[PDB]
Amino acid sequence: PLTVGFSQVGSESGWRAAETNVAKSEAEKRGITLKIADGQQKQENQIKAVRSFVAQGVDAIFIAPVVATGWEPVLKEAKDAEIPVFLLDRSIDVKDKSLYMTTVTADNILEGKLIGDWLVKEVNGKPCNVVELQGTVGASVAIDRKKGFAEAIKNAPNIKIIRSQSGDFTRSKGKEVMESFIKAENNGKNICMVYAHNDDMVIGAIQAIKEAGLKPGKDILTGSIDGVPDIYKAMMDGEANASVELTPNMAGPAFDALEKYKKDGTMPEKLTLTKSTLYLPDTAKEELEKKKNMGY
């Protein structure tokens, strides 16, 4: 029997809730005992959880690292204990890449690029002021999604990012920050598009846009990432424009790699990429139907 300790970031978004659900169902069908620690969005809580898993002598540790920095000490402890570590859905910045087995993740630069490329085509040379709702400060995915979008719009100077602040990857903070952007930009009239690093923040933004008396999806376009059910519902109501799907099944490939490793010492590739796909309202109904069956 295998026991895996998973240090989870928390439950800040519908996507992460689905990731947790899928981690559980994946573990269950594989006969793996999965212990999930909830970090409540704090790195030090995650480090404490990892230390507990090491002390307990679990067979493997999964970590969704809330931010990219500060993991060397605890990863050295896990390595000294000979407990393999698998990173899910965010990445870390360490010199010693042998401190973990693999990172299962999307290409988050690509995710940002997909939204940026879409926007360039959508506005077709016309002026477009963008407001950006970033993810958690220091999260690899926020850094990368910012970069991908920025690079995609570079040759379209008609597009300008005029506001950018973290919305903590939550609906509530996304709404709060969007409200501040709207008030700072002529009741939202000087805003063409909101780019949110996740769907949840943009769903909060959609509320703020409506409450300001504007039409989300028309007066202010939306581009975001995850493909949570509620973004497709928003698309079907005409209130959201573009979203990049992110599989909630980050745990599956990690379990695959773990099982192979425990069976005969087969090491995984250092980067295990999941597939990213842009979805627009024309496929929203079909994608929404695929979702209650994807962990949501």
User: For binding to ligand GZL (CB under 6 A), which residues are involved?
Assistant: 12-13, 15-16, 89-90, 141, 169, 198, 200, 225-226, 246
Nearer to ligand GZL, 226 or 239 (CB): 226
* Angle formed at CA 66 by CA 62 and CA 72, multiple of 5 degrees: 70
Nearer to ligand GZL, 5 or 112 (CB): 112
CB of 197 vs ligand GZL, minimal distance in Å: 7
Is 89 labelled as part of a ligand binding site? yes
CB of 10 vs ligand GZL, minimal distance in Å: 8
Nearer to ligand GZL, 22 or 123 (CB): 22
CB of 93 vs ligand GZL, minimal distance in Å: 15
Nearer to ligand GZL, 24 or 79 (CB): 24
CB of 200 vs ligand GZL, minimal distance in Å: 6
For CA atoms 231, 105, 120, 175, the dihedral sign is positive
What is the pairing mode between strands 242-245 and 277-279? Answer: antiparallel
- Residue 279 makes CB contacts below 8 A (sequence gap 6+) with 227, 232, 242, 243, 244, 245, 287
Three-state SS annotation for 136-182: CCCCHHHHHHHHHHHHHCCCCCCEEEEEEEECCCCHHHHHHHHHHHH
Q: Which residues are annotated as a binding site?
A: 12-16, 89-90, 145, 198, 226
Q: Which residues are annotated as a binding site for beta-D-galactofuranose?
A: 12-16, 89-90, 145, 198, 226
